[PDB]
Subunit: 343 residues, 3 copies
């Protein structure tokens, strides 16, 4: 192997430690487990596939926020197992079933695919509370994963755009604040966006300065009806929750900006958020029914702070607890029901 | 993995999972067939062709997890186009890529002077992720044609210029975001009885997402393609955005710029509303960049959070449906014409 | 040296003039100054780094708008110096401290990084008034200006880029660009357009701005992170920068939708009267004090709308009439001393 090439069966750790850039064998099958990257390196995957066994992650990446060079991973497929067991309860042990675990990340992940991870396919965390460590995840595919992307507290200002999710329970497990998530396509996932207190994958910085990012031009279809196979019921560290397409429950956090999103048979649960704010579902397409499929529900206590502006939709779409004066133009069927949203 | 000019592409694709072209070289291909996933690193090469297209036929395997991927490759379909020739079934073959049952990624490629659709995607049967990003389309009759049941694709950050129709839309649920189009007659077309519906037909159509796009100089100040356009069974008069299908819903439409970029909302499924949200609507003088809705459906259309000038005409949408006021509101039941 | 490879220490000018596509040595360190590209060429940077010295640009690119092939630069890091001197007054001298100076560009810049440029990291100009431009997935850090597009450099796309610790991200003259999905933090100004700018180029301040500005984030511009000064020297006067600064009676504002402004002040000083402007679908968070103020000139206030925006009580909206703000967001205020140029 000339310098820069990493063959199947060779030691990845040694290759990464000795090279600033590494090229994999085009279309080859690798088998990696707990590989450790301690310095910036670029990996050109060249259409290769990385399988694994046992307890993940496939790669541990120890970031150096001081170093101007980023870790970059392009054009690589990661396989976490065979098609998932969706009925297994989630637990601390399964949080290890990751493709990438990055701490203090300065990373670019572009054109990669992630199949059948029992935890988060990608997990980013910060070793200490503070965003000069820029994170970019674009043009990736996620299929069969429990969680797509988990960003811990103080992993901030990342960009996750133009990704495609299908058959995942939770696409974005959101803790760290200020991310832009734009132009992502999701279908047959229980939940595109989850934020609450007491989450998995908060990391060492904890649930700090959370969410309040940007969520634009995304599609979240068939969350609760007409495609998704993952259960609604989901085990957090201290309690069970009932997932929705968009789930937000944290009295100490603000919601992201929410504009240009399509929700066909979604459901959205705005359970709790910081009272010194408003929230607008802006420029959305809201399609649902018949029955309670693709419901948007807000806590009555906060309903007056929620608006639905410039949205299109059908009569079958239910909007729950938002005052009629707050919905311009009329869209869907407006309803009052203080039992909704349930946590 | 290297494929040289003059070698057989079919053999190279059938024998390799990944193929690298000679950087900057000129290839000459015609009716190449790909039957298994393969990645092509184009490396700035150019592919010319002759006769009847496509340049490449791609027979997809939806069962197979690997995608076909094509990067950094320029496709040339001919010399600068004959814009006055009537469109016909024969010209539908003048394609760069024809993909069936696609699981495909097309990134950083350029498509010049195709007499049909530069890219055509179809499904062999009614119900495979599709990504088309950072591509350039210039001089093509049609940019991207997605047939019925080719759904949930992403076409973003592409640039279209001097094309008659950028997106020939049949298949549903695509995201089309951040595309820049100038001097094209039509950015988006959906109707019944289209070209390139493919085997699944006009099924579960449109109702996708159309955000942050720019469609400029469609009917004035740049475009050279004719308005009049031949579908299989009738002639239509194109607009920057043309929608006529009583059995389909419109996409979400937010953050788009329309400078001299006419829109015709002729017909759509009555159990829906439509909003032109967060747009910039600039037009006039005269009837340039008109937004027109059928009077029968006008009450279901809203123009919300849009900016624009006095010269921009908005036709048949009720005044109560336009917040804030933008342009010059007008009633005219002869608009929009098919 | 096989065809298409350019090694450190070899002449870049000769390599570019002899090849249509060039591959750099993966992860190698190059040192270039005033390299000249006269014909389309693609550069695969392969994670290499380019340092420089003296007066920039690192690369001069003389475009041929007649030629269908683009210049393409991928996966390359450009270093303009050590961490910047933010208190130095800006002057004509420093405008040369660029990574890329392109004239009559047909160019794609993808996956590149730009560190510590004393001028514009990227400057695009047109040699004559009336060529597709794409700048995506790039990082800009410590630069005075990120991207400067001169007059008649139009219809470019700048999307999915990340800016931090820059004074001005986009120095906007040329019209009709789409700027979408960009993330900026700790920069004094994300968008600047006015008369009498730096980097107007040979075509001047012609057919300016009026593009598209969507899904961007501009955070901590005037508070809580940014270290660059507000006060900024243009050729003929000093201005006081804001996160979004627009002052040109002869130009229209871009479409403005889906943007987040946390401590991200906006000054709409002057713009063409035959238009309206809408802050659509935004998140507007500010306070306490005058941090993240949105201010419009009282003369033009009636033409400005704030539609479908969310925010907090601390966010100040100045001079926009109450009837123009739907739904209510922030604290509405009248003050004709704002915005100051
Ligand atoms: C971070 Hg292992
Ligand atoms: C970190 Hg602003
Ligand atoms: C995808 Hg919900
Ligand atoms: C089928 Hg939406
Ligand atoms: C599908 Hg050829
Ligand atoms: C391009 Hg209309
Ligand atoms: C030129 Hg708008
Ligand atoms: C173009 Hg120097
Ligand atoms: C970044 Hg203001
Ligand atoms: C702190 Hg935003
Ligand atoms: Cl660790
Ligand atoms: Cl679905
Ligand atoms: Cl967020
Ligand atoms: Cl191979
Ligand atoms: Cl065929
Ligand atoms: Cl034009
Ligand atoms: Cl659509
Ligand atoms: Cl009004
Ligand atoms: Cl070469
Ligand atoms: Cl020059
Ligand atoms: Cl976008
Ligand atoms: Cl602009
Ligand atoms: Cl938007
Ligand atoms: Cl004034």
């Amino acid at each position: 192997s000339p310098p820069g090439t990493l063959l199947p069966g060779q030691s990845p750790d040694e290759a990464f430690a000795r090279n600033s850039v590494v090229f994999l064998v085009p279309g080859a099958e690798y088998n990696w487990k707990n590989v450790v990257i301690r310095k910036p390196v670029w990996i050109y995957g060249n259409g290769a596939t990385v399988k694994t066994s046992g307890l993940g992650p496939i790669i541990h990446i120890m970031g150096d926020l001081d170093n101007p060079m980023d870790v970059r991973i392009q054009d690589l497929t990661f396989i976490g197992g065979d098609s998932p067991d969706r009925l297994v309860p989630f637990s601390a042990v399964l949080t290890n079933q990751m493709a990438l675990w990055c701490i203090d990340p300065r990373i670019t992940i572009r054109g990669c695919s992630f199949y059948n991870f029992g935890g988060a396919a990608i997990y980013l965390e910060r070793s200490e509370r503070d965003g000069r460590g820029q994170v970019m995840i674009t043009d990736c595919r996620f299929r069969g994963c429990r969680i797509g992307i988990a960003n811990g507290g103080s992993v901030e200002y990342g960009l996750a755009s133009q990704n495609n999710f299908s058959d995942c329970q939770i696409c974005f497990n959101v803790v760290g604040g200020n991310w832009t998530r734009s132009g992502n396509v999701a279908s047959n996932c229980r939940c595109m966006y989850l934020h609450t207190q007491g989450m998995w994958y908060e990391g060492a910085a904890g649930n700090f300065n959370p969410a309040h990012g940007s969520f634009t031009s995304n599609t979240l279809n068939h969350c609760d009806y007409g495609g998704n196979l993952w259960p609604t019921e989901f085990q957090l560290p201290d309690r069970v929750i009932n997932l929705a397409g968009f789930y937000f429950d944290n009295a100490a956090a603000r919601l992201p900006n929410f504009s240009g999103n399509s929700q066909w048979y979604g459901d959205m649960k705005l359970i709790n958020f910081l009272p010194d704010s408003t929230f607008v579902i802006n420029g959305g397409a809201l399609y649902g029914g018949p029955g309670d499929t693709g419901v948007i529900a807000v806590a009555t206590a906060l309903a007056a702070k929620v608006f639905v502006i410039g949205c299109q939709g059908n009569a079958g779409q239910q909007i729950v607890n938002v005052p009629a004066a707050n919905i311009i133009p009329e869209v869907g069927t407006r309803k009052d029901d203080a039992t909704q949203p349930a946590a």
